[PDB]
Every structure is written in C-alpha cells, then in structure tokens.
C-alpha cells in the first residue's frame, strides 16, 4: 500500500539520474555512415586510418563510424534508419571505367543518384572519396583504353580554368571529368539543404581523418547559418 508506493518512486530516481549522464555522451558524439560500390577499397581506407563499428577521436572530438556488410541487396529497406547521422561517406573506385563487371562507374553513379534522391535522406551531406588515383593515372597514360569509348561525352570536354593540377594534362582532364559526373547529379537535385564534398584519395594518403573533420565542421556551420536565416 503506502510502503510499496515509496519503493517504486525510489527506483525511478536512480534510473532517471543515470539517463542524465548518458545524455551528455550521446549529444557530444557524431555518427557517420560508410558506403561502397563493391570493390572500391573502403576497408583499406578504414584499416589504414552483421555491422562493423569503429571509434576514434580527433582534437578531443568523438566520432563513431558504421559499416554494413551483413546485408547485400539491390533494395535497401534499412537505409531509413540513418536519417540522423552527421554525414555519409561514399567510396568509389575511379579507375574502373573499363571494367564491365554496365561498367562499374555507371553502377556507382546510379547508386549515388538513388541515395541522393531519397525521401528520408533529404537533409544529409555526402563526403565523396574518389579512390584509386594511381591506377587511373597509369591506365590513362598507357593509352590502350580511352574513356570516350565508354563515356562518349568525353569527346567534347576541356579542363576547367579553375583547376589545381599538381602533372600531365590527360590525368587532370580525366579526374575532373569523373568528378563532374558526380557534381552534376549533386547540384541538379539539391535545393541547398545538403551539399557534396568530393576528394581525391589514394592508397598512401594519411590525411583522410583531417578531411572528414573539416567537412563535418563545415556541415555543422552551414546548418547553423541556414537555420539562423543568414545563408
């Protein structure tokens, strides 16, 4: 009667006190989702720097990344759970324009278009890594395979004036064509609520964590600026 009433209210206070400490950790961490095109070398990127989860901290900021490998299908019903993440990391092998596996770049572009135009992922940015740059450079300077054979739009294309090559012009032209193939889809569908951040990545790069940190900082800053009607 009266004795049991106080006992229940005593255990509620202990539980409600524990939930206050857990809320501090939850709000101070950032969640990232990692995707891939199938043979993009995304495991190498993770290792160098059901479901697989990793924890890491940079500049006293906690990040926590998710990798899905237990589910493999053309239909992604579970993609609606990741509508509260900070950003999505998309890894694509840019040196596979001649691999029929119809080629792999077309499938990667279709997957990117499907992910971008989603009912639930309408406010989430994408950090895009264009992996395997050395292989693309070698296969371009080889001269045996031409991109225009598989992508006829490459016949009439010129390197943009606002470009920053490090080299031989052919690889710069190929790289900028391939990244524009993604930037076009990114800019066409969007309405300013989310952007895309393309990066060129290799097998020896050790500055990918810095890129993720800076992109997340930009994402949050742009979010706040748009919320305050300043942008």
């Amino acid at each position: 009667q009266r004795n049991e009433e106080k006992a229940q209210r005593e255990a509620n206070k202990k539980i409600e006190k524990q939930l206050q400490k857990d809320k501090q950790v939850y709000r101070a961490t950032h969640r990232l989702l990692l995707l891939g095109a199938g043979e993009s070398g995304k495991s190498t990127i993770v290792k160098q720097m059901g479901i697989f989860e990793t924890k890491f901290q940079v500049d006293k900021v906690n990040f926590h990344m998710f990798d899905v490998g237990g589910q493999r299908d053309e239909r992604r019903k579970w993609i609606q759970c990741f509508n509260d993440v900070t950003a999505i990391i998309f890894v694509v092998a840019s040196s596979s324009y001649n691999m029929v596996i119809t080629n792999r770049l077309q499938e990667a572009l279709n997957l990117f278009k499907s992910i971008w135009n989603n009912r639930w992922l309408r406010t989430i940015s994408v950090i895009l890594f264009l992996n395997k740059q050395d292989l693309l450079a070698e296969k371009v300077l080889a001269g045996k395979s031409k991109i225009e054979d598989y992508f006829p739009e490459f016949a009439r294309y010129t390197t943009p004036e606002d470009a920053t090559p490090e080299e031989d012009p052919r690889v710069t032209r190929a790289k900028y064509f391939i990244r524009d193939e993604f930037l076009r889809i990114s800019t066409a569908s969007g309405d300013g609520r989310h952007y895309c951040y393309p990066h060129f990545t290799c097998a020896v790069d050790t500055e990918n964590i810095r890129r993720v940190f800076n992109d997340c900082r930009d994402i949050i800053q742009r979010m706040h600026l748009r919320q305050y009607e300043l942008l």
Binding site: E16, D22, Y26, G70
Partner: protein, 331 residues
C-alpha cells in the same frame, strides 16, 4: 514445360475463388447500425527515451510494457503510475524489434546485427544469443517460455529453441524481405507479410505453407489476426488496408480514403474486433470500422512519424509510439 504447368495451375486457383463469391461483406452489413463517433484523449505520457522509437509490446497483465529506442536502451514502464522499472543497455545501438514474454520472465530484442538476445528479468543480464540469420531481424514473438519465432531480411523465418540455441525448423518461400508476423490465439499458425506484396499462412508443427494471399500492390508493413482467428488484416505503403479470410481464401474488404497518400506503419484490432486502428506516416493515427469501412476517429497527438501501436489484452487502453521519443496512452 514446367513453366506452363505453373501458369495453368494459377488459373485454376483463381477460377475456384470466383465461384465462392456469392456477395460482398459490405452488402450483408448494410442494415447494421453505424458505430457513430469515437473520441479518445491522452491519459499518460512517458518520457525518458533519448532517440526515436521503433518497437513496443504490452504485457499480459495489461499494466507493464517494454519499448526500444535507437539510442540503445530497453526501458520497461509502469503504465499506471508512470514509473520506470528497468533500463537495459544494449551492445548494438541499432534495434528494430522487441517482445515481452507471456509469463513476464524474459524480454527479447534484435536488430541490424542479425542476432536475437534474451534477457532474464527475474534473476537483469543477457541469458542467450541466437545466431544463424543472414539479414537484419524484423520481428520476434514468444510462443512460450522456451520457444520463439523470428523473421529476418534474408526472406526466411525460423523457430528457435532457447535452451540449446538451435533452429528447430525453417520456413522458406518468400522472394522479398519479411517485415512482420503475428501468432494465432491458440499458437498453432502464424502469418507473415513480406516485401513481395504477398502474405503466407504457415504451420508451426509441420513447417509448411498452406495458403498465399496476393491482394496488395506494394511493400507490406504490418499484419494482425482477427480476435476470432479466422481472419487477418494487413497494411502496406500504398495507403490501403485489406481484410483477408482464411476459410474463403480471398480478400473481403478494403479500407482507403481519397485524402490519404502516405504509407501505413502498424495495424491493430480492438477487443471485440469491431474497430481497426492503423498508424500512418502523416504523424497521426486513424480508427476504422471493420464491418462498414468508414472512419470513426483520429488520434493526432504526435509530432513525428508513428512507428508502433498496441492494444491491451483486456482492451482498456491503446498505446502508441512515434519518432519524437514519446509514448502516449489513449483511453
């Protein structure tokens, strides 16, 4: 050869169903009096979840319930006095379902890790882990204290043995992800709604499919038995609900409106089976009439998408959950 025989048999099944349709359910129930207007009000509101909620299951005593959230917690409530009883942390933060044992001794859980976990309430530590599925779990229901039925995203369902952690039997035949299931009142048959817009009726003892219903047009999200046990209802993301009869092997009635275009996330029946409660993507819930197919009430007290819905065994209260991390008790 083989393909031609299958097509020929599909025509025979369809032809037989046409001869059994003397009339429709709507024509017979024209003289019955309308239910009228139904108004419900929120009695309790439960707070404490740090993230959006996926699952909820009432207790057999009609007083305690459990809920799951994306933050990684499994909180057991007290609906009467609004007091938290337990709070079980989870190894994996991606949970999609939960269940409460008929005897109140155990609670099950599962999600994107393709594992079902059983906890011992009256001992709270992990008691058993069941593995073998190759896809995310979608639902789980307790047959008794030592058996459980699970459905996953690998287009298969299984019956487990908690004592030894082995699959007693496996059910195959679906071509898409299985999204939900529901057990018969006597616990001898169950139905499953999958992503190929088809529902099947299984046999637990034998392990074989008996009947198949293909009336919908899109992904099936929810399923529920009629209290009698001779009928069930389904809800898909084409904003339609359908009532199927087992003894007639065909659809009886459809519940749809011209002003609804969003999907349906959950369905449930009333104690007498007269009312049908369904949750929608437009942030609110609608109440239908099972025998006449007309709206009778609206529950619009939530701010985000409604994901779960349940009715007590004694039929006194209705509990709903949504993506704004709040549960509400409607009476």
């Amino acid at each position: 050869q083989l393909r031609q025989e299958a097509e020929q048999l599909k025509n025979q099944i369809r032809d037989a169903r046409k001869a059994c349709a003397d009339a429709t359910l709507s024509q017979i129930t024209n003289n019955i009096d309308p239910v009228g207007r139904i108004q419900m009000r929120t009695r309790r509101t439960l707070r404490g979840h740090l993230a959006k909620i996926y699952a909820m299951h009432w207790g057999t005593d009609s007083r305690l319930l459990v809920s799951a959230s994306q933050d990684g917690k499994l909180i057991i409530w007290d609906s009467y006095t609004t007091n938290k009883v337990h709070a079980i942390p989870l190894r994996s933060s991606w949970v999609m379902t939960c269940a409460y044992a008929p005897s109140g001794n155990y609670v099950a859980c599962g999600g994107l890790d393709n594992i079902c976990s059983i906890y011992n309430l009256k001992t709270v530590r992990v008691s058993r882990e069941l593995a073998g599925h190759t896809g995310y779990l979608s639902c789980c229901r307790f047959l008794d204290d030592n058996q459980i039925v699970t459905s996953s995203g690998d287009t298969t369902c299984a019956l487990w043995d908690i004592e030894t952690g082995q699959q007693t039997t496996t059910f195959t035949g679906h071509t898409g992800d299985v999204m939900s299931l529901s057990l018969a009142p006597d616990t001898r048959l169950f139905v499953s709604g999958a992503c190929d817009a088809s529902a099947k009726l299984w046999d637990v003892r034998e392990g074989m499919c008996r009947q198949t219903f293909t009336g919908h047009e899109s992904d099936i999200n929810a399923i529920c038995f009629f209290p009698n046990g001779n009928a069930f209802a389904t809800g898909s993301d084409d904003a339609t609900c359908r009532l199927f009869d087992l003894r007639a092997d065909q659809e009886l009635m459809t519940y749809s409106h011209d002003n609804i275009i969003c999907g349906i996330t959950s369905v449930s029946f009333s104690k007498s089976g007269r009312l049908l409660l369904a949750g929608y993507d437009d942030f609110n819930c609608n109440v239908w009439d099972a025998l006449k197919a007309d709206r009778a009430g609206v529950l619009a007290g939530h701010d985000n998408r409604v994901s779960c819905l349940g009715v007590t065994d004694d039929g006194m209260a209705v509990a709903t959950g949504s993506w704004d991390s709040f549960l509400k008790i409607w009476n």
